[PDB]
Amino acid sequence: TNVYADSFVIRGNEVSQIAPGQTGNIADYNYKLPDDFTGCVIAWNSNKLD
Amino acid sequence: TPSALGKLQDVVNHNAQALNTLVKQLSSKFGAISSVLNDILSRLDPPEAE
C-alpha cells in the first residue's frame, strides 16, 4: 500500500541497533523501529564509497 | 465422632487444594528460562522474550 525507503550510514557495528526492541545511542537518539515493525532491513559494506 | 461431616470437609479441602495448586502453577517454567515475566523482559530483548 505505502512503501518508504530510508537511507543512513552508520559505523558498521551498530547494525544490531536498527531492530525492534533494541536500545543504544542510534536506537534511542537517531532512528528507532517500533515493536510492530513490518519490513526489511538491507545493510552492506561501504568502506570504499563513504 | 469428628468423622461425621467428612464429605462436607473433603469438599472444601479439595477446593482449597485446587486453589493452592492453581497458585503454585505460576511458579512453573513452561519451557521458558524463568517463571517471572519481568525478569524475562529485563534479560532478553522483546523479539526473543516474545
UniProtKB/Swiss-Prot annotation, chain A:
Top-level taxon: Viruses
Region annotation Integrin-binding motif: where it falls in the sequence: 11-13
Record's subunit section: Binds to host ACE2. RBD also interacts with the N-linked glycan on 'Asn-90' of ACE2. Cleavage of S generates a polybasic C-terminal sequence on S1 that binds to host Neuropilin-1 (NRP1) and Neuropilin-2 (NRP2) receptors. Interacts with host integrin alpha-5/beta-1 (ITGA5:ITGB1) and with ACE2 in complex with integrin alpha-5/beta-1 (ITGA5:ITGB1). May interact via cytoplasmic c-terminus with M protein. May interact (via N-terminus) with host bilirubin and biliverdin, thereby preventing antibody binding to the SARS-CoV-2 spike NTD via an allosteric mechanism.
Function of the protein: Attaches the virion to the cell membrane by interacting with host receptor, initiating the infection. The major receptor is host ACE2. When S2/S2' has been cleaved, binding to the receptor triggers direct fusion at the cell membrane. When S2/S2' has not been cleaved, binding to the receptor results in internalization of the virus by endocytosis using host TFRC and GRM2 and leading to fusion of the virion membrane with the host endosomal membrane. Alternatively, may use NRP1/NRP2 and integrin as entry receptors.
Protein name: Spike protein S1
